[PDB]
Amino acid sequence: ADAIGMVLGTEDVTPTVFWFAVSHGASVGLDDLVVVETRKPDGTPVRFYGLVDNVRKRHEGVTFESDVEDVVAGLLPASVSYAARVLVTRVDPENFIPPQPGDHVRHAAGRELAMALSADKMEEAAFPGGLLADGQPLPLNFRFINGESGGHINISGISGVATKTSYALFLLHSIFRSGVMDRTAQGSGGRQSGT
Amino acid sequence: ADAIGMVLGTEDVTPTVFWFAVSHGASVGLDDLVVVETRKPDGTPVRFYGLVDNVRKRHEGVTFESDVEDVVAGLLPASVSYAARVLVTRVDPENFIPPQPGDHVRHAAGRELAMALSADKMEEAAFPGGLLADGQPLPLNFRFINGESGGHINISGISGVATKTSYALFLLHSIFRSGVMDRTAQGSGGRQSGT
Amino acid sequence: ADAIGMVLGTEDVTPTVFWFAVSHGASVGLDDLVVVETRKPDGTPVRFYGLVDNVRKRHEGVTFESDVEDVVAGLLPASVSYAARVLVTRVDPENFIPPQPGDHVRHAAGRELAMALSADKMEEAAFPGGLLADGQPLPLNFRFINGESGGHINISGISGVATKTSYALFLLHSIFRSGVMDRTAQGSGGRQSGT
Amino acid sequence: ADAIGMVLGTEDVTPTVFWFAVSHGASVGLDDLVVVETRKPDGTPVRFYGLVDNVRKRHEGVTFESDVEDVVAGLLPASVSYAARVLVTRVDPENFIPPQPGDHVRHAAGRELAMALSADKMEEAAFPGGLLADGQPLPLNFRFINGESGGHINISGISGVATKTSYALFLLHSIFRSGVMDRTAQGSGGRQSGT
Amino acid sequence: KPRMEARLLMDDDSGELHLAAFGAYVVGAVSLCPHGTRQAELLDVRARRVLAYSSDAPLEPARLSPRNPHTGVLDYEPYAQVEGPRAAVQKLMLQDEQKLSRQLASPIALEEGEADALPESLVLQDGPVRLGGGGSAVVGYVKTLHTDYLGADRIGLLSSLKCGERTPILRFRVGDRGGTFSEAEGREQRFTWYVRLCDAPFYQHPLAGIMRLEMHAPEDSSFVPAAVQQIADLSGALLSKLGSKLHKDSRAPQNLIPTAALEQAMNRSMGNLELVTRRIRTHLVT
Amino acid sequence: PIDTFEGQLTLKPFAGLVFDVETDRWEAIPTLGIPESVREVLVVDGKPRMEARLLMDDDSGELHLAAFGAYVVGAVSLCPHGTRQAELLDVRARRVLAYSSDAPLEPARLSPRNPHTGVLDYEPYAQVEGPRAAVQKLMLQDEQKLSRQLASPIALEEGEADALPESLVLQDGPVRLGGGGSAVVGYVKTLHTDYLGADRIGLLSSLKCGERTPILRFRVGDRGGTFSEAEGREQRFTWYVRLCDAPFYQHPLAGIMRLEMHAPEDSSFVPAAVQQIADLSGALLSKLGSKLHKDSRAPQNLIPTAALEQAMNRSMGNLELVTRRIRTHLVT
């Protein structure tokens, strides 16, 4: 996971949301979660987990509205700026220190992704119900679906174009063929559901 | 087909909505579908399909309004700045990145029109029920009109000047003469309604 | 406790809200209690109590964003600003004046923390209802819990992820073990409840 | 009594609300009643009575926030700008003109306090029921408390910490001991309640 | 582009005041393709600063940034009574011109005798060609109009020429404008020709839009004139495209499109004037 | 081993260098200042402007230069005691046309609807100095009429103790050669005549704020215009005044202002007459010293002149509209 850009400091970098500029090369699209690492003064590293929710490019270096684009195409020195909004989901340690501007940002797919999707609290019951942009299966929680912690499944949208039943069958297909029923069975301890 | 203009960079070029400029040439109206080509740094092309809804001009080069307006007619350095906004319909691949400010944008009139109006999704039953500004029929999903996927028809508007009853007859004429029912009848496979 | 910085003055320091700049060294996070001294012109000291709930960093010394962030990392005159807002809890004297911009702000560690949480109104029933970010318990009043003045305890939040029964048990464990009932019961003088 | 400050002119000095600056000297808090003298060009004096509710300071002379904040402590040209807002209660004559920016403003403590609190309208029955920051009792119109003009008393506030029952006893103590009932009894002229 | 941070004035156990300055200068280049395949790009922009102090010999060239502030501690000798206000305004421009030519001397198309090789990478310099450049294939353009009136007949034909064409090459001895007592070799030779970019506004003088160019050549070489003959035809259409349209910039004629964007890039390369002054102020007291 | 920054201002003059103005009779007697009762003190200033440069040829084949520059003067009235605030006595708008020996005509203006301008004639030096044909003369003309305007409100000159100055006046820069009889005071700002000597600089930096140096006699020879031939050699009276203690980072010489007082040769009456002014200037300029933090030039400025110079910029209109008006007139 090479570096994709720098944490922009021109805009406010409050811990809730902070912009960052993407360097040339690895592009960044919407809903691609990224991780930012920051060094505290004492020595403890701090990591931020968040998913992007807004991107934009600005042709910095011009001021006249739609008057130099023909000049830019033909002969003019100019550069474009790739900046993307980031909204955090959770911080690595239990503290709220805004990241230092000038930090290195990278999207992670390994163990770091587990803290992004709160996979630490759910290990024995991990349920893959979908795929992400990369080779990343999103782990749902089977505790909410069944009666262990209570909850149901609600699917909504415009009928027709949205293939609701196809996803419903996929969830049923994934429950039986992933062994999630078996994992909860082990360590029953005389519980109500042991089949 | 020569490109109408260029995509702007001064305003935000967020993938949802992006401004663009038109070079001296073909005029751009409202509710005209256009497509822009985007070249990712890795090499994969991306196409954005959208329709324009807001258009404007601005007189650049003059500061004091209506004090030098007559002077421009006689002797003054001034020009125009023609621009418009695009609301994207859908992206040819599945990824949300901002279009690069500096690539050409062109109208869709051949196959590119088909993906703009989701004609690939509705191929077997492409029922024409309207015409755009140019000679391109507008495809209507007959599967939504009938009970294959469900739906009805609701015509609304001010009584009198708005010709409401003319559209019902036109759709009735088009359905019963374009052979849409004949096409959908084939491939019945013992369907409930195959007549 | 060494002061963590001075009070910003470029932004309004209205007695309700006043920004302060944090000097190099110690870092302050959200939901931290700080105090500031203020020399009244008559010579009597004035103290403000409040908690930080908004922190930010801004990159000072850059004209156009993201076009010099790589340059700043390598070599360019730039600056980082570490500011934080305060909502005041209570003023030690019964008057409302703006603190002088340029005064030192320090965290609360001892009796200042008690005066910040209005612990001076809690002398017989000082109840530890949990732990703060640092190693000082948060003292609450048992009078508002029992029936001496009326008032129950209400716990809310989404279930499953946020354990609610566990905290309710913790409160009950703290009631029975800390002996706060004995300190309230003593000196009854004919009180309705003294056991 | 020396003037605390002077009326500002940069902000609007609308007769409803007008800003004013305070010279180096007596401090200004919140909810303190002040009076300003205004001299019309013809020659008739005008006095404005009002109470302050918003106060602020601003550090002028520094541009880059928190970059030179420490520099001001060591060596830098900087000062403060102490100002506050006034909400006018009523005007001594019956006319609405803006006070001239550049005239002195002074506190009301003698007779000028009486016109500020409408003590002239309620002269015979001036029932004291509260004290301001300084040693000036607050007059309450007893004619409104009783049935001479109609009205009741409604004390509201958060239960517990706010001493609600203490105010009812204080008013009862003040009414029955200040001789307000005795004064209003005189001049009965065969009134309904003259005891 | 030159810059002036803060003027200095010191006296070190002498009783006579001495002056110094903390000025700055930055050079840059822009690469264009005349055919128009792609947009222009900035080849390099480097930040440089100089200290221009009189004969007092300061020392300790050390700089430390506490957290944020970066600046360069420097040294140079302007003229080793003394020039009060102009000891750092005509110096710093002179040094800026010196290294800019040296920087441009590295990317240079191979010089051709008569028809040896066409210029692969043309270069263009602001103002008249300097005395330093004698072998490199460089082209200079001037902007001032203090030598416009050649004669009675020359002005009549100069105003009547259409846009895009160039005047014939003329021989100049460049001796009068040369520095007095230069004693390098004597009097050199330059080749000059006029180019028109626009037809000039109706209100403005007809002489507007006319640019003079320089081309340094060896004395009576008779080979360079045949070599730069292509450049004479090349400059007819090259500068026409480079000419800025007459409604954007305040100096609408007599200007170039990339130089306006380039000069603004230099101002961005150096930081804001306020912060750099704040840093040097703190260093002075300590 | 000591270096610092010294405040200085110079825009128009070129090649001023650093000189030595010391002529005769410098003494070291620091005397405190005492305020005196005077009715009014006037501070005057001027501001030049350049509308558009011209270049014309009229059937001659040789170019000529002209400019449409403008200049405005103004005065501010102050009461040293502090009874009321200041008031702007007058601010009048004037313009000039500086053309070479070509003799244009028709000095008339007609406003179509909106814009108005003044057109007139003047003679800069009747090859020619091209770029500086209107940057040095217009300032010269601006100070010429400014002194003439200031010469009308003037306190009656006193021989030795005849009468105190009723209405004091103050002029920017050195006193000009035109003013010889009026009771005027000028203040200079350039620091090119600062280093008087080894001992003189030591005492100049060590003097406390508010006091004035003893009056010294100057022969005003070197700074005088070459080949002036007005009357010969004049005499001026100078003394330094300090306004502030100067910032720690700034040079110790900061906050020191030099004043001029034109006097007749060996009169022996004016020195006794301007003795009160020497004590008067000790406290007058201390109050008039601009406080540091608001202005970029923290020392070496006055509160009224900073507001006065901004007032002149308002007296003339915006640069854009006037250029638009003259452009239309030129083509027609």
Side-chain angles (χ1 to χ4, degrees), chain F residues 271-321:
Chain F
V274 302
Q275 198 71 21
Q276 44 164 331
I277 315 297
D279 292 7
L280 184 137
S281 67
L284 172 43
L285 277 296
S286 293
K287 169 146 59 59
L288 266 294
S290 175
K291 324 193 291 213
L292 72 166
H293 56 257
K294 316 149 279 293
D295 207 342
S296 59
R297 36 188 76 80
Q300 309 310 92
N301 204 357
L302 312 178
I303 308 85
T305 188
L308 183 63
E309 61 76 12
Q310 188 274 331
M312 269 148 287
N313 274 357
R314 274 150 33 86
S315 57
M316 317 165 267
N318 63 84
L319 172 43
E320 280 88 308
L321 189 152

Coordinates of all heavy atoms in Angstrom, one line a residue, chain F residues 271-321:
Chain F
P271 N 16.3 83.9 16.2 CA 16.6 82.9 17.3 C 15.9 83.1 18.6 O 15.5 82.1 19.3 CB 18.1 83.0 17.4 CG 18.6 83.4 16.1 CD 17.5 84.4 15.6
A272 N 15.7 84.4 19.0 CA 14.9 84.6 20.2 C 13.4 84.4 20.0 O 12.7 84.1 20.9 CB 15.2 86.0 20.7
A273 N 13.0 84.6 18.7 CA 11.6 84.5 18.4 C 11.1 83.1 18.3 O 10.0 82.7 18.8 CB 11.2 85.2 17.1
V274 N 12.0 82.2 17.8 CA 11.6 80.8 17.6 C 12.1 80.0 18.8 O 12.0 78.7 18.8 CB 12.2 80.2 16.3 CG1 11.8 81.1 15.1 CG2 13.7 80.2 16.4
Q275 N 12.5 80.6 19.8 CA 12.9 79.9 21.1 C 11.7 79.2 21.7 O 11.8 78.1 22.2 CB 13.6 80.8 22.1 CG 14.4 80.1 23.1 CD 15.6 79.5 22.6 OE1 16.1 79.9 21.5 NE2 16.2 78.5 23.3
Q276 N 10.5 79.9 21.7 CA 9.3 79.2 22.2 C 8.9 78.0 21.3 O 8.5 77.0 21.8 CB 8.2 80.3 22.2 CG 8.1 81.1 20.9 CD 6.7 81.8 20.8 OE1 5.7 81.3 21.3 NE2 6.7 83.0 20.2
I277 N 9.1 78.1 20.0 CA 8.8 77.0 19.1 C 9.7 75.8 19.4 O 9.3 74.7 19.3 CB 9.0 77.4 17.6 CG1 8.3 78.8 17.4 CG2 8.4 76.4 16.7 CD1 6.8 78.8 17.7
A278 N 11.0 76.1 19.8 CA 11.9 75.0 20.2 C 11.3 74.2 21.4 O 11.4 73.0 21.4 CB 13.3 75.5 20.5
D279 N 10.8 74.9 22.4 CA 10.2 74.3 23.5 C 8.8 73.7 23.2 O 8.4 72.7 23.7 CB 10.1 75.2 24.7 CG 11.5 75.5 25.3 OD1 12.5 75.1 24.7 OD2 11.5 76.2 26.4
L280 N 8.1 74.4 22.3 CA 6.8 74.0 21.9 C 6.8 72.7 21.1 O 6.0 71.8 21.3 CB 6.1 75.1 21.0 CG 4.7 74.9 20.5 CD1 3.9 76.1 20.7 CD2 4.7 74.4 19.1
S281 N 7.8 72.5 20.2 CA 7.9 71.3 19.5 C 8.3 70.0 20.3 O 8.1 68.9 19.9 CB 9.0 71.4 18.4 OG 10.3 71.6 18.9
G282 N 8.8 70.3 21.6 CA 9.1 69.1 22.4 C 7.9 68.3 22.8 O 8.0 67.1 22.8
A283 N 6.8 68.9 23.0 CA 5.6 68.2 23.4 C 4.5 68.1 22.3 O 3.6 67.3 22.4 CB 4.9 68.9 24.7
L284 N 4.6 69.0 21.4 CA 3.6 69.0 20.3 C 3.7 67.7 19.5 O 2.7 67.0 19.2 CB 3.8 70.2 19.4 CG 3.0 70.3 18.1 CD1 1.5 69.9 18.3 CD2 3.0 71.7 17.5
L285 N 5.0 67.4 19.0 CA 5.2 66.2 18.2 C 5.1 64.9 19.0 O 4.8 63.9 18.4 CB 6.5 66.3 17.5 CG 6.7 67.1 16.2 CD1 5.8 66.4 15.1 CD2 6.3 68.6 16.4
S286 N 5.3 65.0 20.3 CA 5.1 63.8 21.2 C 3.7 63.3 21.1 O 3.4 62.1 21.0 CB 5.6 64.1 22.6 OG 7.0 64.3 22.7
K287 N 2.7 64.3 21.2 CA 1.3 63.9 21.1 C 1.0 63.5 19.6 O 0.2 62.6 19.4 CB 0.4 65.1 21.5 CG -1.0 64.9 21.2 CD -1.9 65.6 22.2 CE -1.6 67.0 22.4 NZ -1.8 67.8 21.2
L288 N 1.6 64.2 18.7 CA 1.4 63.9 17.2 C 2.1 62.7 16.8 O 1.9 62.3 15.6 CB 1.9 65.1 16.4 CG 0.8 66.2 16.0 CD1 -0.2 65.5 15.1 CD2 0.1 66.7 17.3
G289 N 3.0 62.1 17.6 CA 3.7 60.9 17.2 C 2.7 59.7 17.0 O 1.9 59.4 17.9
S290 N 2.8 59.1 15.8 CA 1.8 58.0 15.5 C 2.2 56.8 16.4 O 3.3 56.3 16.4 CB 1.9 57.6 14.0 OG 1.1 56.5 13.7
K291 N 1.2 56.2 17.0 CA 1.4 55.0 17.8 C 1.6 53.8 16.9 O 1.0 53.7 15.8 CB 0.2 54.7 18.7 CG -0.4 56.0 19.3 CD -1.4 55.7 20.4 CE -2.7 55.0 19.9 NZ -3.9 55.3 20.7
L292 N 2.5 52.9 17.3 CA 3.2 52.0 16.4 C 2.3 51.0 15.7 O 2.4 50.7 14.5 CB 4.3 51.3 17.1 CG 4.1 50.2 18.2 CD1 5.4 49.5 18.5 CD2 3.5 50.8 19.4
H293 N 1.3 50.4 16.5 CA 0.8 49.1 16.0 C -0.2 49.2 14.8 O -0.3 48.2 14.1 CB 0.0 48.5 17.2 CG -1.0 49.3 17.8 ND1 -0.9 50.0 19.0 CD2 -2.3 49.6 17.4 CE1 -2.0 50.7 19.3 NE2 -2.9 50.4 18.4
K294 N -0.8 50.4 14.6 CA -1.8 50.4 13.5 C -1.1 50.5 12.1 O -1.5 49.8 11.2 CB -2.8 51.5 13.7 CG -3.4 51.7 15.1 CD -3.7 53.2 15.4 CE -2.4 53.9 15.8 NZ -2.0 53.3 17.1
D295 N -0.1 51.3 12.0 CA 0.5 51.6 10.7 C 1.7 50.7 10.4 O 2.4 50.3 11.4 CB 0.9 53.1 10.6 CG 0.8 53.6 9.1 OD1 0.8 52.7 8.2 OD2 0.8 54.8 8.9
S296 N 1.9 50.4 9.2 CA 3.0 49.6 8.8 C 4.3 50.3 9.1 O 5.3 49.7 9.7 CB 2.9 49.2 7.3 OG 2.9 50.4 6.5
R297 N 4.4 51.6 8.8 CA 5.5 52.4 9.2 C 5.2 52.8 10.6 O 4.7 53.9 10.9 CB 5.8 53.6 8.3 CG 4.5 54.2 7.7 CD 4.8 55.2 6.6 NE 5.2 54.6 5.4 CZ 4.3 54.0 4.5 NH1 3.0 54.0 4.7 NH2 4.8 53.5 3.4
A298 N 5.5 52.0 11.6 CA 5.1 52.2 13.0 C 5.7 53.5 13.5 O 4.9 54.3 14.1 CB 5.5 51.0 13.8
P299 N 7.0 53.8 13.4 CA 7.5 55.2 13.8 C 7.4 56.0 12.5 O 7.0 55.6 11.5 CB 8.9 54.9 14.3 CG 9.4 53.7 13.6 CD 8.1 53.0 13.0
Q300 N 7.9 57.3 12.7 CA 8.1 58.2 11.5 C 6.9 58.5 10.7 O 6.8 58.4 9.5 CB 9.2 57.6 10.6 CG 10.5 57.1 11.3 CD 11.1 58.2 12.2 OE1 10.8 58.3 13.4 NE2 11.9 59.1 11.6
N301 N 5.8 58.7 11.5 CA 4.5 59.1 10.9 C 3.7 59.8 11.9 O 4.0 59.9 13.1 CB 3.8 57.8 10.4 CG 2.8 58.1 9.3 OD1 2.6 59.2 8.9 ND2 2.1 57.0 8.8
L302 N 2.6 60.5 11.4 CA 1.7 61.2 12.2 C 0.3 60.7 12.0 O -0.1 60.2 10.9 CB 1.7 62.7 11.8 CG 3.1 63.4 11.8 CD1 3.0 64.8 11.4 CD2 3.8 63.2 13.1
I303 N -0.6 60.8 13.0 CA -2.0 60.4 12.9 C -2.7 61.2 11.9 O -3.4 60.6 11.0 CB -2.6 60.4 14.3 CG1 -1.8 59.6 15.3 CG2 -4.1 59.8 14.2 CD1 -0.7 60.4 16.0
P304 N -2.7 62.5 11.8 CA -3.5 63.2 10.9 C -3.1 63.0 9.4 O -3.9 62.9 8.5 CB -3.4 64.7 11.3 CG -2.9 64.7 12.7 CD -2.0 63.5 12.7
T305 N -1.8 63.0 9.2 CA -1.3 62.9 7.8 C -1.7 61.5 7.2 O -1.9 61.4 6.0 CB 0.2 63.1 7.7 OG1 0.6 63.2 6.3 CG2 1.0 62.0 8.4
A306 N -1.7 60.4 8.0 CA -2.2 59.1 7.5 C -3.6 59.2 7.1 O -4.0 58.6 6.0 CB -2.0 58.1 8.6
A307 N -4.5 59.8 7.9 CA -5.9 60.0 7.5 C -6.0 61.1 6.4 O -6.9 61.0 5.6 CB -6.7 60.4 8.7
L308 N -5.1 62.1 6.4 CA -5.2 63.1 5.4 C -4.8 62.6 4.0 O -5.5 62.8 3.0 CB -4.2 64.3 5.7 CG -4.2 65.5 4.8 CD1 -5.6 66.2 4.8 CD2 -3.1 66.5 5.2
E309 N -3.7 61.8 3.9 CA -3.3 61.3 2.6 C -4.4 60.4 2.0 O -4.6 60.3 0.8 CB -2.0 60.6 2.7 CG -1.9 59.3 3.6 CD -2.5 58.1 3.0 OE1 -2.8 58.0 1.8 OE2 -2.6 57.1 3.8
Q310 N -5.1 59.6 2.8 CA -6.2 58.8 2.3 C -7.4 59.6 1.9 O -8.1 59.2 1.0 CB -6.6 57.8 3.4 CG -7.6 56.7 3.0 CD -9.1 57.2 3.1 OE1 -9.4 58.0 3.9 NE2 -9.9 56.6 2.2
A311 N -7.5 60.8 2.4 CA -8.6 61.7 2.0 C -8.3 62.3 0.6 O -9.3 62.4 -0.2 CB -8.7 62.9 3.0
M312 N -7.1 62.6 0.2 CA -6.8 63.0 -1.1 C -7.2 62.0 -2.1 O -7.7 62.3 -3.2 CB -5.3 63.4 -1.3 CG -5.0 64.9 -1.0 SD -3.4 65.2 -0.3 CE -3.6 64.6 1.4
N313 N -6.9 60.7 -1.8 CA -7.3 59.6 -2.8 C -8.8 59.6 -3.0 O -9.2 59.2 -4.1 CB -6.8 58.3 -2.2 CG -5.3 58.0 -2.6 OD1 -4.7 58.8 -3.4 ND2 -4.8 56.9 -2.2
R314 N -9.6 60.0 -2.0 CA -11.0 60.1 -2.2 C -11.4 61.3 -3.0 O -12.4 61.3 -3.7 CB -11.7 60.1 -0.9 CG -12.0 58.7 -0.4 CD -12.1 58.8 1.2 NE -12.6 60.0 1.7 CZ -13.9 60.3 1.8 NH1 -14.8 59.4 1.5 NH2 -14.2 61.5 2.3
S315 N -10.6 62.4 -2.9 CA -10.9 63.7 -3.6 C -10.9 63.5 -5.1 O -11.8 64.0 -5.8 CB -9.9 64.8 -3.2 OG -8.6 64.4 -3.5
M316 N -10.0 62.7 -5.7 CA -10.0 62.3 -7.0 C -10.7 61.0 -7.2 O -10.8 60.2 -6.3 CB -8.6 62.2 -7.6 CG -7.6 63.3 -7.1 SD -5.9 62.9 -7.4 CE -5.5 62.2 -5.8
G317 N -11.4 60.8 -8.4 CA -12.2 59.7 -8.6 C -11.3 58.4 -8.8 O -10.1 58.4 -8.8
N318 N -12.0 57.3 -9.1 CA -11.3 56.1 -9.3 C -10.5 56.1 -10.6 O -10.9 56.8 -11.6 CB -12.3 54.9 -9.4 CG -13.3 55.0 -10.5 OD1 -13.0 54.7 -11.7 ND2 -14.5 55.6 -10.2
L319 N -9.4 55.5 -10.7 CA -8.5 55.5 -11.8 C -9.1 55.0 -13.1 O -8.8 55.4 -14.2 CB -7.2 54.8 -11.5 CG -6.1 54.6 -12.5 CD1 -5.9 55.8 -13.4 CD2 -4.8 54.1 -11.9
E320 N -10.0 54.0 -12.9 CA -10.6 53.3 -14.1 C -11.5 54.3 -14.9 O -11.4 54.4 -16.1 CB -11.4 52.1 -13.6 CG -10.6 50.9 -13.3 CD -10.1 50.8 -11.9 OE1 -9.5 51.8 -11.4 OE2 -10.3 49.8 -11.2
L321 N -12.4 55.0 -14.2 CA -13.4 55.8 -14.9 C -12.8 57.0 -15.6 O -13.2 57.3 -16.8 CB -14.5 56.2 -14.0 CG -15.8 56.9 -14.5 CD1 -17.0 56.6 -13.6 CD2 -15.6 58.4 -14.7

